[PDB]
Design a protein around this ligand. Structure first.
Ligand SMILES: O=c1[nH]n2cc(-c3n[nH]c(-c4cnc5c(Br)c(=O)[nH]n5c4)c3[N+](=O)[O-])cnc2c1Br
Ligand SMILES: O=c1[nH]n2cc(-c3n[nH]c(-c4cnc5c(Br)c(=O)[nH]n5c4)c3[N+](=O)[O-])cnc2c1Br
Ligand SMILES: [Zn+2]
Ligand SMILES: [Zn+2]
Lengths: 138, 133
């Protein structure tokens, strides 16, 4: 059946501005781009920045919790944390407990996240102190 | 330096309805769930359905092109295509890919082919003003 996430398409108003974001600060190997989109890659992940003229740069106050996270090495956390803080990448939550994570947003207001830890490490941590009404399955 | 997509969190109004969707129709291995969220898996992918009370089930006409795709075997295409076509999963685009949506209006996609196969296809017939690297 389904293998995994094939690609991720993000609607962006300004293409040049948004693609510069992902190309420079996160440094996703920009494969190709054209007049109405761009393809970027990040190892197993495939990112597509499709130009949509109906995408207003929505503030986090006017957006739902839907966000997109990225896997970064634990050692390389502070480095990329400053990378966004020094570049003025805006924040939308502080991430209290739950591990080590830094929440932020892109130019067009797509809520993003930098996280250290896989699902297995999260599930193990929850077995210690679980959430409200948490149930396991395996 | 940072590796691939760590996880994907989706805001959902009704949890019970949403949790059933990904668990039953797709082959998402539901790991855990609680009063305001759930953890599901899809091989290398980690999916989180967070319960948001500010998430209206938005129609596709009132949503941007931002969507999330899934890799499915070419042979197993019709199988999961039938599963959604028979279950009445509403579609929003079609032009090998199958575009549909979740209960809360999150635009989704079923695609066969990786980026390398796509980049090769563009090297044959490229888009308007396409530039490669
Ligand atoms: O009539 C025409 N329509 N048209 C559209 C495009 C186009 N622009 N961006 C994308 C595109 C590419 N890749 C992706 C991905 Br991957 C994704 O998720 N969205 N997406 C859009 C496409 N497309 O072929 O789908 C080019 N030529 C034409 C002609 Br000629
Ligand atoms: O006072 C309290 N507030 N509170 C919130 C939660 C909670 N609800 N959803 C998530 C959640 C989990 N995992 C994830 C992921 Br993975 C993700 O992307 N979002 N996300 C949210 C959490 N959380 O553990 O952060 C639990 N306990 C409490 C207490 Br006690
Ligand atoms: Zn797509
Ligand atoms: Zn998160």
């Amino acid at each position: 059946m389904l293998q995994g996430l094939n690609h991720l398409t993000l609607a962006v108003s300004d293409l040049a501005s948004s693609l510069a974001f992902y190309q420079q600060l996160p440094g996703m190997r920009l494969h190709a781009s054209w007049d109405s989109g761009a393809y970027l890659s990040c190892g197993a992940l495939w990112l597509c920045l499709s130009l949509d003229e109906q995408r207003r740069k929505t503030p986090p106050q006017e957006s739902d919790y839907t966000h997109y996270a990225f896997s970064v090495a634990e050692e390389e956390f502070a480095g990329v944390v400053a990378l966004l803080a020094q570049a003025g990448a805006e924040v939308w939550k502080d991430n209290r407990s739950e591990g080590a994570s830094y929440y932020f947003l892109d130019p067009d207001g797509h809520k993003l996240e930098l996280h250290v830890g896989n699902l297995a490490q999260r599930l193990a941590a929850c077995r210690e102190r679980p959430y409200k009404g948490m149930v396991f399955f395996d």
